[PDB]
Amino acid sequence: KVVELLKQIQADASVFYVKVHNFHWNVKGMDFHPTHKATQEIYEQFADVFDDVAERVLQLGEMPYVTLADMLKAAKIKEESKTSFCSKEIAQAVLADYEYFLKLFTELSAQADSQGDKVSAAYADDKVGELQKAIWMLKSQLA
Amino acid sequence: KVVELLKQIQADASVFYVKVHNFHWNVKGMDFHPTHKATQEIYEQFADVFDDVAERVLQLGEMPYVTLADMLKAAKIKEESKTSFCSKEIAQAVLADYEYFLKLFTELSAQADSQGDKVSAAYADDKVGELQKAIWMLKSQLA
Amino acid sequence: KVVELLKQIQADASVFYVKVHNFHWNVKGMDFHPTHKATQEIYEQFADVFDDVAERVLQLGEMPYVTLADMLKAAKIKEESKTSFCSKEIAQAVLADYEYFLKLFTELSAQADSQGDKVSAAYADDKVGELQKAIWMLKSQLA
Amino acid sequence: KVVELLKQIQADASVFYVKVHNFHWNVKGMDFHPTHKATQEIYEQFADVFDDVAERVLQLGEMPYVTLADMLKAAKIKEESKTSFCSKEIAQAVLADYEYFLKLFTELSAQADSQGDKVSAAYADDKVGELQKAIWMLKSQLA
Amino acid sequence: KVVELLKQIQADASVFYVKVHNFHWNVKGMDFHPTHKATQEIYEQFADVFDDVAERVLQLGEMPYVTLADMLKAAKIKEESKTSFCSKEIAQAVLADYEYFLKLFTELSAQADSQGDKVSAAYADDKVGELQKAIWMLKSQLA
Amino acid sequence: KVVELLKQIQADASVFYVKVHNFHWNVKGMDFHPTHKATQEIYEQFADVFDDVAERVLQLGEMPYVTLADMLKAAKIKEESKTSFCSKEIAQAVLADYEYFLKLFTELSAQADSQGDKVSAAYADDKVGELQKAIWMLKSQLA
Amino acid sequence: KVVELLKQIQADASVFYVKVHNFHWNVKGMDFHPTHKATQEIYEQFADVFDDVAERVLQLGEMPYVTLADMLKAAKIKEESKTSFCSKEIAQAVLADYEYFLKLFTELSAQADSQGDKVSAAYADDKVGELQKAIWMLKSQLA
Amino acid sequence: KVVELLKQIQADASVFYVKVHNFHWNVKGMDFHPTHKATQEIYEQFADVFDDVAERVLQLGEMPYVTLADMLKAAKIKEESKTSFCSKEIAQAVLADYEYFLKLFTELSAQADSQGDKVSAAYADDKVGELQKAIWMLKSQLA
Amino acid sequence: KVVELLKQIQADASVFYVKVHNFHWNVKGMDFHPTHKATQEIYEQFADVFDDVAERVLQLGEMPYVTLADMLKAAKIKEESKTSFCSKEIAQAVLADYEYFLKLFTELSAQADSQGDKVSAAYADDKVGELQKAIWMLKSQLA
Amino acid sequence: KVVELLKQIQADASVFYVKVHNFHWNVKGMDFHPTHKATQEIYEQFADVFDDVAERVLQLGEMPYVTLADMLKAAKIKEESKTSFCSKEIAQAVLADYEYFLKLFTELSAQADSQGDKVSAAYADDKVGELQKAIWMLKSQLA
Amino acid sequence: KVVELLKQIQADASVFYVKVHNFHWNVKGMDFHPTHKATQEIYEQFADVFDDVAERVLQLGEMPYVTLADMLKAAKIKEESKTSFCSKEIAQAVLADYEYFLKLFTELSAQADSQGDKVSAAYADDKVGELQKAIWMLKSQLA
Amino acid sequence: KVVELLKQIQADASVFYVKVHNFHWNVKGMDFHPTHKATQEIYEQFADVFDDVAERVLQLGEMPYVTLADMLKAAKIKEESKTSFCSKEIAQAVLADYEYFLKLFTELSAQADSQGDKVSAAYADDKVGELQKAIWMLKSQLA
Ligand SMILES: [Fe+3]
Ligand SMILES: [Fe+3]
Ligand SMILES: [Fe+3]
Ligand SMILES: [Fe+3]
Ligand SMILES: [Fe+3]
Ligand SMILES: [Fe+3]
Ligand SMILES: [Fe+3]
Ligand SMILES: [Fe+3]
Ligand SMILES: [Fe+3]
Ligand SMILES: [Fe+3]
Ligand SMILES: [Fe+3]
Ligand SMILES: [Fe+3]
Numbered sequence A, B, C, D, E, F, G, H, I, J, K, L: 001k002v003v004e005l006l007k008q009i010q011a012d013a014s015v016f017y018v019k020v021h022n023f024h025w026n027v028k029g030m031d032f033h034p035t036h037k038a039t040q041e042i043y044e045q046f047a048d049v050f051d052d053v054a055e056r057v058l059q060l061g062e063m064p065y066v067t068l069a070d071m072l073k074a075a076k077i078k079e080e081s082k083t084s085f086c087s088k089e090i091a092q093a094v095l096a097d098y099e100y101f102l103k104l105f106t107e108l109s110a111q112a113d114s115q116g117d118k119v120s121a122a123y124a125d126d127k128v129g130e131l132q133k134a135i136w137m138l139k140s141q142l143a
Helices: A002-026 A032-059 A068-074 A087-114 A118-141 B003-026 B030-058 B068-074 B087-114 B119-141 C002-026 C031-057 C068-074 C087-114 C120-143 D002-027 D031-061 D068-074 D087-114 D118-142 E003-024 E032-059 E068-074 E085-117 E118-142 F002-026 F032-057 F068-074 F088-114 F117-143 G001-027 G032-059 G067-075 G087-114 G120-143 H001-028 H032-059 H068-074 H088-112 H118-142 I002-026 I032-059 I070-072 I085-112 I118-142 J002-026 J032-059 J068-074 J088-114 J120-140 K003-024 K032-059 K069-075 K087-113 K117-142 L002-026 L032-059 L066-076 L087-114 L118-142
Strands: none
Touching: A002 A032, A002 A068, A002 A087, A002 B068, A002 K117, A032 A118, A032 B003, A032 K032, A032 K117, A068 B068, A068 E032, A087 A118, A118 C068, A118 C120, A118 D118, A118 G032, A118 G120, A118 J032, B003 B087, B003 L066, B030 B087, B030 C031, B030 C120, B030 E032, B030 K117, B087 B119, B087 I032, B087 K032, B119 E032, B119 K117, C002 C031, C002 C068, C002 C087, C002 D002, C002 D031, C002 D068, C031 D002, C031 E032, C031 E118, C031 G120, C031 K087, C068 D002, C068 D068, C087 C120, C087 I118, C087 L118, C120 E003, C120 E032, C120 G120, C120 I070, D002 D031, D002 D068, D002 D087, D031 D118, D031 E118, D031 G032, D087 D118, D118 E118, D118 K003, D118 L066, E003 E032, E003 E068, E003 E085, E003 H032, E003 H068, E032 E085, E032 F117, E032 H001, E068 F002, E068 H001, E068 H068, E068 K069, E085 F002, E085 K087, E085 K117, E118 F117, F002 F032, F002 F068, F002 I032, F002 I070, F032 F088, F032 F117, F032 I002, F032 K032, F032 L032, F068 G067, F068 I002, F068 I070, F088 F117, F088 I032, F088 I070, G001 G032, G001 G067, G001 G120, G001 J068, G032 G087, G032 G120, G032 I032, G032 I118, G032 J002, G067 J002, G067 J068, G067 K069, G087 G120, G120 L066, H001 H068, H001 H088, H032 H118, H088 H118, H118 K032, H118 K117, H118 L002, I002 I032, I002 I070, I002 I085, I032 I070, I032 I085, I032 I118, I032 K003, I032 L118, I085 I118, I118 J032, I118 J120, I118 L118, J002 J068, J002 J088, J032 J088, J032 J120, J032 K032, J088 J120, J120 K032, J120 L032, J120 L118, K003 K032, K003 K069, K003 K087, K003 L032, K003 L066, K032 K087, K032 K117, K032 L002, K032 L118, K069 L002, K069 L066, L002 L032, L002 L066, L002 L087, L032 L087
């Protein structure tokens, strides 16, 4: 269902938001500043995903998550408790999460288009395009 | 301790951040728009408290929270699971949490100044003043 | 026909454009300024719908309406002769016309896609999303 | 009467506003782009005259027209059913209507100064100068 | 005399300037923020009226008031000594003072044109229109 | 005739335009830079009356001057063949010419209002006001 | 395949990019400035098509063209060896090339949607809409 | 008491606010324009002190002055009834009043810090520093 | 001599400045607005050549012209007494004068480099380049 | 010949423009992002060189290349057929191409000054300096 | 005395200012560009420190250093006579000097508060926080 | 030698940079504020020559001065030990040093042109012109 897929993204966005803050704070090594800058941009864009996806559930007449307790249980992304990272561990860590979200937004688009919900479908397709490009930049950067 | 007071603000900030999104999404009534805008300014300003205090913990040579699991357990702020709000009851809920944060930052200033950490105290004093101004506006609006 | 749906939207837009000027001028009560501001943004956005929809008719090789007499006869939105309004009256009036526009744009999108006209469908899908969002906000404000 | 003249300008502006969209959409020939841009600048200026005179009627304590049906009966300016124009027709059509608006605004200034309504006369004199300038520019372009 | 009207407007501006600060500080109730923000706009506009009229007296060759003691003695606007207001009280008080200013500026325009001082008359006609627009909005807001 | 008054201003503007350049280039003494900056502002503003005044003559259906030979003959402003100036000499010179233009714009406004030419008169009343303010400031500076 | 259509657009874009520079340099006649300004915006837009289209090939895991030699052998758009043009046959030339790109992007969208590549299709639908708008405007100018 | 120091600053600010207007209007001599611009920025900055200090009293739970009658009787800054000044007397008058304000803000910082009111003390320390910078600059200019 | 050439450039600039105003006011035909706006930019750029050249003569330790009487007798550009122009004739008039200024500036550069005056030569070389670009564009539009 | 050197730079710029696109797309390794940004700006300055030199050829009365077939025949920059690069590789490749362009522009400057074509020499001297700065920075980066 | 400590900071600031220019010019290695940009911001911010401290000395009624000869003597920042550095080397040098400025600013704050000079202490505390944040970032980059 | 003249300019720029801060801090008298600001603009411009000139040495393959100890021994501009200046003394201190820099940049241009180093000569000629203009202004101000 379109709504249930939206709430999965919502719960995963809020966990990824914090996970990316940890990368932002605890990155080590010579390119500390560029990764410090980039991670901050990532969690700001997923703060926007967090809000948009939730408000879209509201426009569709349902209830998004409103507690971190429920978002933690619902989330399929794993929290990161370690507190020191080099730049390429973070690129690898973010790349895997991008591929999970890409699968998630690809399903939302296919499912919304089958229900004739082209608005939810259009939103997913733009995020699909944004992720495919970021993914290709990371696989090139880790090459 | 300065660090353990900062980490409390950190945990409560992240819970307050989500609670205010719920007010943002689920406010009803004639004053839907100003409340929808005010709440958004608030969670953007507490996203900044969340990051500032965490990095200040980092500059003092200790570790902040890096997982939502730890932040929920540490947060004294109560999550709000109900999902429909009148405007006045958002002003009251927000006023009460502001008074909790005000008490926390005032102790942070007193504790940091004890220890000669005037930087942490200066930061806390700014938020004390910002909270005192906002708390006084809410009291006038609810009067 | 895609063109007939576009031209219906054009005629209803031009009638809605004037009606909202009336709400803009004749709102009474303590919410005068917020309503006076919001109505003006509404008619400026429908001035743009009026113009976009007309030239899309021309890019498809047909003629849009060019006279007020033809648009008044074709419009299903009805004019408002009352010259004094309460603020919740205006929100209710605007909510109803939006749902009419939402249905008009959904049919334009569905019909345009069925003919392989993905450009017209894409334009309509943008307006469906904007109308779905505003309707949720208007329903929340009257709740 | 000042209000009668203002409400006459109101109706004729609404008719001219749509007529200039027709010129805007259906100009043909080599000077298409400059004419396409000039016509759009003209209907945006008359959207502003439309709102200004209507609001001026209200601050003088009376009611302007609020329906397109009422403005078409009051409008002295002919609607235009033709659907294709060369660039010199449009400059001729616009010049003819500008001279009509000039007489109308000159009468408003004279009547308003009779009644000691100097703010209404001042607004009218500003539009008289704007019309006298554009009229002189159109005569040079047609010379 | 033109300068006596300017100096009277000058004195009444200075008292109204402080009075509006009192409304700005002590408004209570749910419409706190819009009134808090409108009142500040108002007292900055009368700060500029205070300076404009004073400097115009100087261009006409006499002296404006230069002490608060004389401004209180000369003013006809009355000071507000209570320290708590709801939003509708403030609106009714500003409307009453605006109508007083509108007569002062209308008389200034009338007298200045009778003497051939068209510059002073034009300045007053500008303030007359601003008051007439603001008055209409307040009457609508209290309706 | 308003035209003959306008063209007189035209001729005097262009002569004063060059005279002010001489003050700009050849000011001596410690106030070099404020006077150097002020004279440039002055001649840029009179380049503007030069063009505005000619275009109005054209909108009234007559011809302005089109050669320096004709303007130099028509001009009453005297040219300055001295090539070195003290800062107060410049202030004195500008003040004398400003009172000449003020007389000219007052007579232009008086005459245009006699014939019902409110546009030309409104243009002149603004220049009367700008000169009265500038004249006052110059008198204070030389006082 | 989507990729081989994307790469075809890439090759034709680079030839069209240089062809429009030739028009940009060698247009003659009284309309020199607008077409000179117009062509520069066209080749700046196809530089952007050139880069967008190639990067999408990479996000799809393939290689775009990387040499001018390969793109020349692949482009179907004809090079222009003539070295002097009037304004109308530049418009006819751009109109003909726009209709070729339009078919290409329409094919690209149809193939992308067939395979479930909604991102590539969304990009193509944008270019289809922009070409349809420009084609309509070119036909009006050549009418 | 901190509020008693705040309310004294408020009363003296409003009196000083007007006195500087008198300096602004009636400065004579060669340095007219720099002093005119300087006094305007001084009185606009004390208008801001006036409002800040008053709002601080309200956040501390007390009432500031709300009438010019009370502020005149509380003020210690003497009003200036003279209407003509050279530039150097204005600098002397402003220098004397600045050291009076400096002593007031210094006492305010001392009392607020002794009572643990770090917020009002921080505000006072900022004005103390700004007054010291302005005091030093004025002493150099009068040297 | 460099000063000789600079003062000749000075005199011809001031006459051309007014001539281009005549073209600006008195162009007729369907290209009125492009020619109206283009001619204005020309005279604003020569107003600056006028000032640059005069100030450079001053830096070289001699005196520029300071009266229109002196510049009129020195100028070689001829004044234009006709008061009605077609677009093509304005272009040809401007092209002929541009080739004169180009000559003049090429002689200034060559002469300045002889005596080692690289600054004057560098300014001249920039004007040579700007005129060569403009001359080629004018020849293309006249082809 | 100045023109033959300009046309050579033109032909090499067009090949270098594409080569740098290949570097832009296919850079791999840790330093993916900065190189992706750097290569894109590089090709944007050479798009500007491409247009400037061609327009300078036209100002000299000769014809630039207008065909990709002729430019690749004339170009001496080797095309790059590889599709995978680390950042150091790209730096060494660009450095070699910069040193070639540097000899082209120094020879261009030397020839133009020989013939008295100081405009072409100054354009070349600016490009020589820009290349010398970038060459120094690349040698520093490869050190 | 706070003044000696301000003057020590002044002398070290000017020596640090030049040393950072040296790092700015002579960094080598694949990380030239980020370091070149970062060093330029450091020396511009220490130019601001150089000026603030000197002006703070003067407001305290003392004299700062005014010659490089005296500042070289007093400075404890060591000059660097090497002309080639890798990036890690520069970060080490900058981190060591930042801990020196941090110590230096901490004593300034403590001693200024001892004398009730809260203005000097507040300025120093701002610098302590800026240095603590930058030091944390440099330690992470060298980690 | 070009490099030898460049590093001489570098050393004198760094000494002049500090001397002008001394003028900036220790100016006294009524004309305090313009002089405080002009000196600030001057030392910021010589900070730019300091960096430009050092970087030009580097791209010519040499090392500039890198320590204040070396720059002090190379500088010919004398340091200033006095600590108080009137504005007329500063104006001629600056004029004398400007005449020195003018000679230095002039000889740099001549030497660089002798070596075919036209980039260094163009930069020097730009500084020669900027100095020639300022020297003309200071002489007029001291006249
Ligand atoms: Fe939101
Ligand atoms: Fe952060
Ligand atoms: Fe349009
Ligand atoms: Fe309105
Ligand atoms: Fe003022
Ligand atoms: Fe004009
Ligand atoms: Fe790209
Ligand atoms: Fe306030
Ligand atoms: Fe100038
Ligand atoms: Fe170009
Ligand atoms: Fe400073
Ligand atoms: Fe640099």
